[PDB]
Amino acid sequence: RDLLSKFDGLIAERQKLLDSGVTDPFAIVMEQVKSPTEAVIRGKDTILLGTYNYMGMTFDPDVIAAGKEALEKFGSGTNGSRMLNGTFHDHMEVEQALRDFYGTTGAIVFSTGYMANLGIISTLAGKGEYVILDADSHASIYDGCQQGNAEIVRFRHNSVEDLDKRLGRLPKEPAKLVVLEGVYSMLGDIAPLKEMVAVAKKHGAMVLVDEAHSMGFFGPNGRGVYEAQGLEGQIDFVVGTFSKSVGTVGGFVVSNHPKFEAVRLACRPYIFTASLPPSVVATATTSIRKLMTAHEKRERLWSNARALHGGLKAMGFRLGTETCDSAIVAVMLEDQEQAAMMWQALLDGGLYVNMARPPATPAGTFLLRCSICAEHTPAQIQTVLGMFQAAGRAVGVI
Amino acid sequence: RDLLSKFDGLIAERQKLLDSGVTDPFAIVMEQVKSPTEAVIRGKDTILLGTYNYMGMTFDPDVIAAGKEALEKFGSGTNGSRMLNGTFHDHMEVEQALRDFYGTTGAIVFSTGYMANLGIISTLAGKGEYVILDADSHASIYDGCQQGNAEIVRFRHNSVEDLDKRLGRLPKEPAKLVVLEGVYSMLGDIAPLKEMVAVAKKHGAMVLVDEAHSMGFFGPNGRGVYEAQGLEGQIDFVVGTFSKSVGTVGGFVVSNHPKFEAVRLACRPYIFTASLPPSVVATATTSIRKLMTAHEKRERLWSNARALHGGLKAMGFRLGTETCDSAIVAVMLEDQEQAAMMWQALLDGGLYVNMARPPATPAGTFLLRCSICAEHTPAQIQTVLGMFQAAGRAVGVI
Ligand SMILES: Cc1ncc(COP(=O)(O)O)c(CN[C@@H](CO)C(=O)O)c1O
Numbered sequence: 001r002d003l004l005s006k007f008d009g010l011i012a013e014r015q016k017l018l019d020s021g022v023t024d025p026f027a028i029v030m031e032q033v034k035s036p037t038e039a040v041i042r043g044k045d046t047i048l049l050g051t052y053n054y055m056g057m058t059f060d061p062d063v064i065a066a067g068k069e070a071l072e073k074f075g076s077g078t079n080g081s082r083m084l085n086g087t088f089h090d091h092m093e094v095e096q097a098l099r100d101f102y103g104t105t106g107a108i109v110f111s112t113g114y115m116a117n118l119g120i121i122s123t124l125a126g127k128g129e130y131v132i133l134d135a136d137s138h139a140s141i142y143d144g145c146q147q148g149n150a151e152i153v154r155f156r157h158n159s160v161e162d163l164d165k166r167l168g169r170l171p172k173e174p175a176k177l178v179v180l181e182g183v184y185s186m187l188g189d190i191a192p193l194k195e196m197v198a199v200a201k202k203h204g205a206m207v208l209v210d211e212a213h214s215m216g217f218f219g220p221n222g223r224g225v226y227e228a229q230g231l232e233g234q235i236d237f238v239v240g241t242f243s244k245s246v247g248t249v250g251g252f253v254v255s256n257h258p259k260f261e262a263v264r265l266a267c268r269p270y271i272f273t274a275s276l277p278p279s280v281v282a283t284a285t286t287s288i289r290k291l292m293t294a295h296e297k298r299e300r301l302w303s304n305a306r307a308l309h310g311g312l313k314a315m316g317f318r319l320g321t322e323t324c325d326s327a328i329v330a331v332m333l334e335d336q337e338q339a340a341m342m343w344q345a346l347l348d349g350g351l352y353v354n355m356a357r358p359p360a361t362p363a364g365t366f367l368l369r370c371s372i373c374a375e376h377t378p379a380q381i382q383t384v385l386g387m388f389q390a391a392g393r394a395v396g397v398i
Numbered sequence: 399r400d401l402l403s404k405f406d407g408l409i410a411e412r413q414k415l416l417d418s419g420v421t422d423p424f425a426i427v428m429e430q431v432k433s434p435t436e437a438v439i440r441g442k443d444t445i446l447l448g449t450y451n452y453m454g455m456t457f458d459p460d461v462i463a464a465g466k467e468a469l470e471k472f473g474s475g476t477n478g479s480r481m482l483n484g485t486f487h488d489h490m491e492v493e494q495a496l497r498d499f500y501g502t503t504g505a506i507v508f509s510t511g512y513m514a515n516l517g518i519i520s521t522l523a524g525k526g527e528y529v530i531l532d533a534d535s536h537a538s539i540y541d542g543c544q545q546g547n548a549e550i551v552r553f554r555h556n557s558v559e560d561l562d563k564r565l566g567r568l569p570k571e572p573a574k575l576v577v578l579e580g581v582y583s584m585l586g587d588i589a590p591l592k593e594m595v596a597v598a599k600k601h602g603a604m605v606l607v608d609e610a611h612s613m614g615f616f617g618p619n620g621r622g623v624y625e626a627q628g629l630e631g632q633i634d635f636v637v638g639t640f641s642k643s644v645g646t647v648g649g650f651v652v653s654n655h656p657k658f659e660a661v662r663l664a665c666r667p668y669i670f671t672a673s674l675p676p677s678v679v680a681t682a683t684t685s686i687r688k689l690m691t692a693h694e695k696r697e698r699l700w701s702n703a704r705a706l707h708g709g710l711k712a713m714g715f716r717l718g719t720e721t722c723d724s725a726i727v728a729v730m731l732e733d734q735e736q737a738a739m740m741w742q743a744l745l746d747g748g749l750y751v752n753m754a755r756p757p758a759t760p761a762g763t764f765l766l767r768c769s770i771c772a773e774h775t776p777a778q779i780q781t782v783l784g785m786f787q788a789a790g791r792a793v794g795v796i
């Protein structure tokens with residue numbers, strides 16, 4: 001045995017999945033991507049319904065032009081830390097775009113969303129302090145807790161009551177960070193932020209909200225679930241990513257706290273990595289600024305989401321949410337075999353959705369996840385519904 | 399007090415540095431970048447000698463063309479995990495380029511170099527296993543140790559003897575990972591890998607070598623210090639980055655271990671982050687493949703390094719290394735004031751080098767770090783030497 005012997009179980013599990021005759025759902029290659037909604041997968045034209053490209057920004061002509069210009073003018077990379085040689089014109093641009101987007105004085109960009117959560121959580125809360133998080137928080141939030149030296153307190157999934165009880169049992173004096181998400185990505189349901197934030201404040205805690213799955217399409221300014229629920233000016237830190245609505249890679253944290261900039265002085269995942277390529281921060285800047293006034297896209301996205309959610313529910317699918325509360329629609333299935341057969345029938349028929357990842361999914365839960373795009377046409381949505389009807393009936397789900 | 403009160407000391411320290419009248423060395427903005435060797439900083443044309451762009455690939459015409467084409471054909475981002483919707487044509491291309499570059503069957507690309515170290519170390523070595531690392535290892539290697547649940551064993555900087563003693567005191571049965579770097583980035587000196595690897599193997603340990611600061615210009619195939627020292631076929635895992643010789647963002651690990659691919663099934667920093675934008679992996683692919691035969695660049699780089707190292711030593715500067723052993727030249731100074739005055743005089747005279755970062759530098763050590771580029775001309779190197787002579791004499795360093 002050696003260091004890789006520990007993976008023998010996972011290897012056997014993947015082979016067991018493949019023994020069923022399905023395409024490996026975790027090795028899909030997009031050979032060509034024609035648009036935000038169309039790709040070629042396994043030599044077949046396929047509608048994309050599992051890409052989390054909520055506002056279709058990845059093919060926006062202004063976004064693409066900004067990226068090409070940045071490559072030409074500034075080259076392919078910075079090769080350095082933001083603290084040394086890695087801050088170019090476009091890095092200053094992208095941080096100001098975020099300040100303008102969120103109405104904050106502070107904005108710190110990280111090289112990935114994962115690293116923003118890893119770094120902000122492990123840097124803000126130290127030894128003798130507390131991080132209080134939802135039991136089903138994103139992996140990056142859990143990894144930030146592991147990276148730090150704080151006391152970690154999980155509360156039962158989606159319970160305002162359990163947050164309140166768990167917070168209330170902690171000592172009063174030490175500083176505390178409550179970490180919440182606006183939209184939770186497994187089922188696409190929304191957090192009761194208004195109520196949870198009131199509880200956090202009662203107990204003197206600071207609040208961090210991850211708005212990765214809401215940017216550009218929740219709240220009057222598209223700032224997130226917290227804005228939609230009336231919490232403008234009440235959230236200490238908002239963490240987000242460039243890899244959803246914005247359409248590239250990178251992470252960020254925004255805040256009005258007067259000492260917020262000091263995070264750059266301490267945060268290891270900010271300091272000890274190369275800054276993003278000029279093209280990446282240029283595309284992000286342009287996308288973020290367009291997202292401030294992308295009203296037609298926002299309306300199309302929600303229209304499409306309501307149509308898909310309403311249609312699948314009407315057909316008899318069991319969904320992760322009773323009402324259409326985000327741009328994620330989760331279809332719940334009875335076993336791994338049913339999920340596999342459904343996913344394959346959809347793929348073979350020309351539709352890509354996500355199969356739940358075993359590392360992300362609790363045992364005994366089986367689903368497919370759909371993500372709506374502002375650039376889906378009403379026609380594509382009806383085509384998708386017809387494909388779900390055909391596959392669902394053929395597999396015996398409905 | 400709140401969660402940011404812990405930064406009050408760091409804030410005061412930065413202000414103390416600024417009280418000296420220097421430009422903030424940790425807030426430099428590259429307003430324009432004309433080439434790998436020239437920028438506009440504070441409205442002034444400046445020679446770049448602190449960018450770690452060893453092979454000048456960031457402005458290579460093939461590299462830039464590949465990036466622009468990828469933006470046009472595939473859009474600005476993938477918006478998803480490699481395990482789901484994030485594997486495009488160009489991700490498969492970049493992993494094959496690495497296999498060809500290193501002569502390995504295995505290659506896993508991560509969204510940053512930092513995340514490659516974080517993930518590979520925390521995933522390979524589990525509870526009851528050991529990670530044995532040099533005391534002065536890169537922050538990302540230390541952070542990977544923190545992220546995992548292994549026993550961490552540091553050995554005294556640059557000691558084959560201490561590695562041997564520390565390893566020998568551990569129980570024989572548990573699996574062990576020895577982590578080394580080829581070139582250490584603080585002083586630009588080289589590790590005695592041949593001897594350290596023989597020690598690791600005597601004790602039955604697996605070896606990971608970080609070749610971030612050697613790719614493309616050490617060894618017959620440019621694979622790194624390990625190749626230069628005759629260790630081809632003896633290193634279990636090689637970790638690297640795209641942010642130095644390659645010229646963009648991203649991380650990687652390569653290996654011939656038959657179970658290596660299984661890392662994709664387990665590694666949280668691989669799974670739970672968006673894959674790199676098409677343009678980024680296209681630029682990396684093109685750069686990596688060009689680096690396989692970039693002999694003129696490699697010769698220019700080493701010629702320039704020897705000229706700079708030899709010239710600064712000749713003038714009376716105290717350097718971090720007695721002989722020119724890498725493309726990093728560290729100039730050692732007596733105190734923070736001397737380092738500050740030197741750095742400012744160089745900047746005002748039209749040269750950018752790095753001031754040592756306080757988070758990276760041990761107390762009582764003060765240096766400036768120069769990084770050579772294959773695209774520096776002999777003329778620029780002599781200009782740089784003249785600037786060091788003028789600044790060094792004016793400040794009293796020489
Ligand atoms: C030996 C070594 N290994 C790994 C990394 C991380 O690579 P990344 O910067 O591409 O994430 C670095 C980064 N080094 C630079 C950032 O690019 C730094 O300021 O620390 C490194 O020096």
Ligand SMILES: Cc1ncc(COP(=O)(O)O)c(CN[C@@H](CO)C(=O)O)c1O
Pocket residue numbers: 112113114115117138140181185210212213241242243249250251477478479669670671672673
């Ligand atoms: C709520 C939340 N917060 C943070 C992140 C990390 O952002 P990044 O993917 O841009 O690093 C994700 C990533 N989510 C995707 C990868 O992009 C995943 O497969 O998990 C997220 O869902």
